[PDB]
Amino acid sequence: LAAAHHRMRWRADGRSLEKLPVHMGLVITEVEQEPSFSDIASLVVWCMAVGISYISVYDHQGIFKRNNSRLMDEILKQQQELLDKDDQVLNCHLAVKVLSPEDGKADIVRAAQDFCQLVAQKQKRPTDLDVDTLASLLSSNGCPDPDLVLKFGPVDSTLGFLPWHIRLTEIVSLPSHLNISYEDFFSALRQYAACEQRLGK
């Protein structure tokens, strides 16, 4: 029953903020030889515990994409610890995406190929591709855009993380994901909650 209290506290923490991200990206700019899946998994579990719907894990080298099973294994491990495997497995796969560079520019090019194929089949017109239609066409589909990205490590760059989708993402930088603490994670959430979004007005 102590797990119900922990869930209650994390829910209260997320609810207490002026706003919460619906979709968070975690951009690791420096992955070590033995990747720290336990630190990444804890970040993911904290997001889900505070109430964030979607989490995208990203590194430029595709290490997490090529170690997807180990990552989810560690996420599920820490999801049970201090917080029906099939429902738990399904819910993490719905909420958690592991991304690599090809999910950015290469996917926009994929969408452009698909749309131009319809043009060549006389089924669509070049003027039919506006901003909103292209967004529908990307493999993001109905998933909301990332509103907050936590960028870890020494590289001052998004390193190809979903360029189309980060038009308005707040980018908060921390020095390391290694031995990352809940307080440090939550302080990043407080920064995002206090940010002012004017949308051009």
Rule CB under 6 A: which residues touch ligand IPE? 198-200
43 φ, ψ (degrees, to nearest 5) = -60, -45
Instruction: Mark out the alpha helices in the chain (DSSP H runs).
Output: 2-16, 37-50, 68-80, 85-95, 105-120, 131-137, 182-194
For another protein, which stretch binds (CB under 8 A), given 31-39, 80-88, 158-166, 180-188? 158-166
Task: Name the minimum Å distance from CB 198 to ligand IPE.
Answer: 4
Instruction: Say if residue 104 carries a ligand binding annotation.
Output: no
**Cα separations (Å) of 81 from 61, 126, 179, 198?**
30, 53, 17, 40
**150 near 174, Cβ under 8 Å?**
yes
Closest CB to another protein among residues 83, 193: 193
Q: What is the size of the binding site for another protein (CB under 8 A)? A: 53
List the chain gaps (C–N > 2.5 A) by preceding residue. Answer: 83
Residue 142 as a binder of another protein (CB under 8 A): the answer is: no
The reply, when asked if residue 118 is annotated as ligand binding, is no
Q: Residue 5 CB, nearest distance to another protein (Å)? A: 34
- Judged by CB under 8 A, the stretch of 3-11, 13-21, 82-90, 126-134 that binds another protein is 126-134
Which residues belong to the annotated binding site? Answer: 199-200
